[PDB]
């Protein structure tokens, strides 16, 4: 079967200010089929109780989901999103970079 | 309101 691998963007809801509470988003899109595993990571460890949007899809039939949680940016802490999908042999990790 | 869809 023809399948489509996810695009991944990791970013904040509001402009990042060190020490100011914010929301960390991992937006996965462009993928098919719809089953997908997404973790948000803080210093390499899974953040618990991350919420996500209801499954929907784009005009090209590819799916999209937004995973999100509260976070506080700091110089010391690193955040990331880890995605697995049938199209991937290993989980894909995208680091949060406040410049993107 | 939604519509009842038809079987393929």
């Amino acid at each position: 079967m023809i399948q489509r691998t996810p695009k991944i963007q990791v970013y904040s809801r509001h402009p990042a200010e060190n020490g100011k509470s914010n929301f960390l988003n991992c937006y996965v899109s462009g993928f098919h089929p719809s089953d997908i595993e997404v973790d948000l990571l803080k210093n390499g460890e899974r953040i618990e109780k991350v919420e996500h949007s209801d499954l929907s899809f784009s005009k090209d039939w590819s799916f999209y989901l937004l995973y999100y949680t509260e976070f506080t940016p700091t110089e010391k802490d690193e955040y990331a999103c880890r995605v697995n999908h049938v199209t991937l042999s290993q989980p894909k990790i995208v680091k949060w970079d406040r410049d993107m | 309101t939604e519509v009842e869809t038809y079987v393929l």
Partner: protein
């Protein structure tokens, strides 16, 4: 401006793991306002935007019944599709459908939609005339023959031109403060040295609604389409959207580049430059 109501239906079989899950989500433009999920502990059409909460019990009951009937119809459709493609009972498959209506600034029907995909590939669609079908292959021609025999297009046209448009107009009035408000992007240009020889200019658009936007870079007035990295418009989680466009520029040539932004919420289009 113009507005749309759309429902997005996904059904996914999972042999050995129960019956196929069905989820319906409803949107007005970029705003989700309802969901229904057969995998919820108590499946029910549920509000997802504040302005729909005022609808009375009849709306919730009728939409839940429609969605529960649709769960069964989609599971029958998935059984039929596995047969039409001579597929094994072992694999998982996906049936998606989108439908709804678009109106112009005066509330008049612009057009209707009803179209389906199997395993991510177009399967059958109602044509813009709301009276005939386009089938992708000989399996979808079976569905088309069945729907022609049962005059399904006539039923969908009545829904799309009637119920669909009337409800879209009702939602637009009930949610007028958000659905009929365009929030302009907040825009700025950042600069990121790469090496002694080059730097990235990134043009940001933040906080905008709806998601349609034009964001481009020009060099000396010429569009830089092939050299621009343009990320997909992404949800902020607060109703609004974000997007950026980046170009790699020779060090010292930053002022030759301009970022151009168009969006419904802006009184006039914007031209921005790096402001060091």
């Amino acid at each position: 401006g113009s507005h749309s109501m759309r429902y997005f239906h996904t059904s996914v079989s999972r042999p050995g793991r129960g019956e196929p899950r069905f989820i319906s989500v409803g949107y007005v433009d970029g705003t989700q306002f309802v969901r229904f999920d057969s995998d919820a502990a108590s499946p029910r059409t549920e509000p997802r935007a504040p302005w729909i909460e005022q609808e009375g019990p009849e709306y919730w009951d009728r939409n839940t019944q429609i969605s529960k009937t649709n769960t069964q119809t989609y599971r029958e459709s998935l059984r039929n599709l596995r047969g039409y493609y001579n597929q094994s009972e072992a694999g998982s498959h996906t049936l998606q459908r989108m439908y709804g209506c678009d109106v112009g600034p005066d509330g008049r029907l612009l057009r209707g939609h009803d179209q389906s995909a199997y395993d991510g590939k177009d399967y059958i669609a109602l044509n813009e005339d709301l009276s005939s079908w386009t089938a992708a292959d000989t399996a979808a021609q079976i569905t088309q023959r069945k729907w022609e025999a049962a005059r399904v297009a006539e039923q969908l046209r009545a829904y799309l031109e009637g119920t669909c448009v009337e409800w879209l107009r009702r939602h637009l009035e009930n949610g007028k403060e958000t659905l009929q408000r365009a929030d302009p992007p907040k825009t700025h240009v950042t600069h990121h040295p790469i090496s002694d020889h080059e730097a990235t200019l990134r043009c940001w658009a933040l906080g905008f609604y709806p998601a349609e936007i034009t964001l481009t870079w020009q060099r000396d007035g010429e569009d830089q389409t092939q050299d621009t990295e343009l990320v997909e418009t992404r949800p902020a989680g607060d109703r609004t959207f974000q997007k950026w466009a980046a170009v790699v520029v020779p060090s010292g040539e930053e002022q030759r580049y301009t970022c151009h932004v168009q969006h419904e919420g802006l009184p006039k289009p914007l031209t921005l430059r790096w402001e060091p």
